[PDB]
Subunit: 90 residues, 3 copies
């Protein structure tokens, strides 16, 4: 299996975030208009998806990181990554 | 291979949908502001992607479900899932 | 491994683009309101993700194509595909 990516963007600049799962680790590369840099997001995963929405001045990002049959939602809401309430079943 | 996900979101609440392909079946988990629940979407797939757009009061969702070399588009347009016109070639 | 897809959409029509990685090649299917057609995008990849944003009359698309541990960003900015500045590390 090749590395696996997920991408999202917001605004008009725009800002872009690209998440890459490589050998069980997801890392984050960021564009905010002038140069790519490495973002804070660094969590385990073989598979990744992402969605985002911009409300006011805060970007809200949800990254779904999967290893085996376990999917962990990671949340950015303008001030730090947290593990969210998402579960795959009740 | 780990489970594989795809995510989309809309509005300001927001609403989120997360599709998970697990052992050949795609299922759907939904957030509309207070609690995750299991959505109606339940179709075959080893791979999934999604996109969506909100027009008026109706969310329009397109889920691309793949098994082997066959990709099936599933459509939500506010009142039920249907298999759409998408084909991978003419 | 089944084929792998990524999808994006824009506008109200809407326009949809679906990228499919199949046997190391990514191809593109397009909807702009009346019929699916094959788009110009044709580049190597085992994995694909996409994001897009509409500014003025130009759609801007970013397709992240991965083979092995190499991820190539492809950019549409209204007048042709180009390989962008994205790198996975500095």
């Amino acid at each position: 299996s090749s590395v696996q990516t997920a991408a999202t963007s917001w605004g008009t600049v725009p800002s872009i975030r690209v998440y890459t799962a490589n050998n069980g680790k997801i890392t984050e590369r960021c564009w905010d208009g002038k140069g790519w840099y490495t973002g804070a997001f660094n969590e385990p995963g073989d598979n990744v998806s992402v969605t985002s929405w911009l409300v006011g001045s805060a970007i809200h990002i949800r990254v779904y990181a999967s290893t085996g049959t376990t999917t962990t939602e990671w949340c950015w809401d303008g001030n730090g990554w947290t593990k969210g309430a998402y579960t795959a079943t009740n």
